[PDB]
C-alpha cells in the first residue's frame, strides 16, 4: 500500500512494524525515483507548500526543479504519498487530506468550487473517490457545465468552452502537524 497511516499520526498504530502502510510522521511525504528506490527529499514542506498552490506548477527545492504536472523533476519521476481523502473517514479524523478543486477563470486565476456552482470541493472529491472516471454534470448561474475527471477539465455543455480543472491539498506546515498530535 501506498497510504500514510492514520493511526501512526494519532495514537498509535496497533500493527506496529507489520502495518501494511506506509508510517511517516507527516500526512504527505514527497519522494524521487532513483534507480529502483524511491528516496524522501529534503525539504517535503517546501515542496508541499508549492504543491498546494494551485497556481504554482514549478518549485525548485535544492538543485532540483520539480514540475508538479509531469511530477518529475530534472529528468527523475517524483510522488506524493498521502493519507486518505477527508472524505472517506469521519471529521474527527484530524490527518486525513482535504483536497480542493477549482477551476481557472476568464481573469486567469483559480477559483474553489462552490465559491455560483451547484458543487463543492467535498462533492467533487467524493465522487472522484467513488468513481474516478465519471463526470459531474453541474449548474453555475443559467449555464450548465460537465466536469470530466479523467481530463480534469470542464466544458459548458451548450458553448463546448473548456476550462482548466485542478485538484490540490491544504498545506498544513509541519509545526502544526505537531500542533495537531497534541
Ligand atoms: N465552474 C464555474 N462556476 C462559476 N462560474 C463559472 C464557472 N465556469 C465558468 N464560469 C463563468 O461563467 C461565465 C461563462 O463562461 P463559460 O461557461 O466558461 O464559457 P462561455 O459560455 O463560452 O462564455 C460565455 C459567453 O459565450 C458566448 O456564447 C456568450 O456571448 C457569452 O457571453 C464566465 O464568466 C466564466 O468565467
Ligand atoms: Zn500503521
Given at each position: 500500500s501506498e497510504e500514510i497511516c492514520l493511526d501512526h499520526l494519532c495514537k498509535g498504530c496497533p500493527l506496529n512494524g507489520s502495518c501494511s502502510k506506509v508510517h511517516f510522521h507527516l500526512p504527505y511525504r514527497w519522494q524521487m525515483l532513483i534507480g529502483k528506490?524511491?528516496?524522501?527529499?529534503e525539504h517535503m514542506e517546501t515542496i508541499?507548500?508549492?504543491?498546494?498552490?494551485?497556481?504554482?506548477?514549478?518549485?525548485?527545492?535544492?538543485?532540483?526543479?520539480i514540475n508538479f504536472r509531469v511530477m518529475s523533476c530534472d529528468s527523475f519521476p517524483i510522488r506524493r504519498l498521502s493519507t486518505p481523502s477527508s472524505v472517506?473517514?469521519?471529521?474527527?479524523?484530524?490527518?486525513?487530506?482535504?483536497?480542493?478543486?477549482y477551476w481557472k477563470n476568464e481573469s486567469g486565476t483559480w477559483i474553489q468550487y462552490g465559491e455560483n456552482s451547484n458543487v463543492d470541493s467535498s462533492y467533487l472529491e467524493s465522487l472522484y473517490?467513488?468513481?474516478?472516471?465519471?463526470?459531474?454534470?453541474?449548474?453555475?448561474?443559467?449555464?450548465n457545465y460537465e466536469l470530466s475527471f479523467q481530463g480534469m477539465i470542464q466544458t459548458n455543455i451548450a458553448?463546448?468552452?473548456?476550462?482548466?480543472?485542478?485538484?490540490?491539498?491544504?498545506?498544513?506546515?509541519?509545526?502544526?502537524?505537531?500542533?495537531?498530535?497534541?
Open positions: 528506490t524511491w528516496t524522501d527529499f508541499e507548500k508549492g504543491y498546494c498552490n494551485p497556481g504554482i506548477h514549478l518549485c525548485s527545492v535544492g538543485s532540483y526543479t472517506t473517514k469521519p471529521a474527527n479524523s484530524v490527518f486525513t487530506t482535504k483536497w480542493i478543486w473517490q467513488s468513481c474516478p472516471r465519471g463526470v459531474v454534470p453541474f449548474q453555475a448561474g443559467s449555464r458553448s463546448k468552452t473548456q476550462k482548466d480543472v485542478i485538484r490540490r491539498p491544504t498545506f498544513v506546515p509541519q509545526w502544526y502537524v505537531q500542533q495537531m498530535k497534541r
